[PDB]
Write a protein that binds this ligand. Structure first.
Ligand SMILES: NS(=O)(=O)c1ccc(NCc2ccco2)c([N+](=O)[O-])c1
Ligand code: NA
Ligand SMILES: [Zn+2]
Length: 257
């Protein structure tokens, strides 16, 4: 099955998932000098006050913080989006060292990690139907650099010991994702895909320009997770990122001048 290693990683995914070579794959490099300001783009409306987190899961690839998406409790709208997109989960991608880990790059710069807040378009009723649509998903991407600690991340860091291996989960109620945002909501946007199999081309990507800072100790704890299950040889969960893919016939738009 797919993963991030030499024999099952991104260079192999196309065999089982031929859309890996498709026309709107993610991530991409954001070439900042050619991303054109679009004055018709609206401010992003992130409404997370009523978010209800439920659980955190090590799925063998990353960890997902899952939300109650049976009502419009945490939603993303505005920006490039038409309608309303409901938060279902967030997760991260990160590196073995601070100089890599992000999926998107900015003028070829790799950040230490990247946070993805995943939302589905409520006009399709359920996530499974949304991922059959070219405008089914909106993913808010936020870069992480290593510096000062992010206070709102520490509750995540501290539960990771309890979900070390694939298939382990823990209660994770009352987590406020507002604590993971940067100050500015300036963004770049483009049409793309999921960055892991099944690589479905359903995503409006919204990538924030301002990184959040996390401490070295915080990211070091991400790197103590395991890809393997309990009682299997230890494979540290590091370098769970897909490299940049060809931009093809797409334009990245900037929300800011
Ligand atoms: N790195 S990402 O934000 O693009 C991403 C990748 C895969 C999946 N899911 C994979 C999957 C299984 C069935 C359909 O879809 C998700 N997600 O679900 O939020 C997000
Ligand atoms: Na452009
Ligand atoms: Zn992701």
């Amino acid at each position: 099955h797919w993963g991030y290693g030499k024999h099952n990683g991104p260079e192999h995914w196309h065999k089982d998932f031929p859309i890996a070579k498709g026309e709107r794959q993610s991530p991409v490099d954001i070439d900042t000098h050619t991303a054109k300001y679009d004055p018709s783009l609206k401010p992003l409306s992130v409404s997370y006050d009523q978010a209800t987190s439920l659980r955190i899961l090590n799925n063998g690839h990353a960890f997902n913080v899952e939300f109650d998406d049976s009502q419009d409790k945490a939603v993303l709208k505005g920006g490039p989006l038409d309608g309303t997109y409901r938060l279902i989960q967030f997760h991260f991608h990160w590196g073995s060292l601070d100089g890599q880990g992000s999926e998107h790059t900015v003028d070829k710069k790799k950040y230490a990690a990247e946070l993805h807040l995943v939302h589905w378009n409520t006009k399709y009723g359920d996530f499974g139907k949304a991922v059959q649509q070219p405008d089914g998903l909106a993913v808010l991407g936020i870069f992480l650099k290593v510096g000062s600690a992010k206070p709102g991340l520490q509750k995540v860091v501290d539960v990771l010991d309890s979900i070390k291996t694939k298939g382990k989960s823990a209660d994770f109620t009352n987590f406020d994702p507002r604590g993971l945002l940067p100050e500015s909501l300036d963004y770049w946007t483009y049409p793309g895909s999921l960055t892991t199999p099944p690589l479905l081309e359903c995503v409006t990507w919204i990538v924030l320009k301002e990184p959040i800072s996390v401490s070295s100790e915080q990211v070091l704890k991400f790197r103590k997770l395991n890809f393997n299950g309990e009682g299997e040889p230890e494979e540290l969960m590091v370098d769970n990122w897909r490299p940049a893919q060809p931009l093809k016939n797409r334009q990245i738009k900037a929300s800011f001048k």
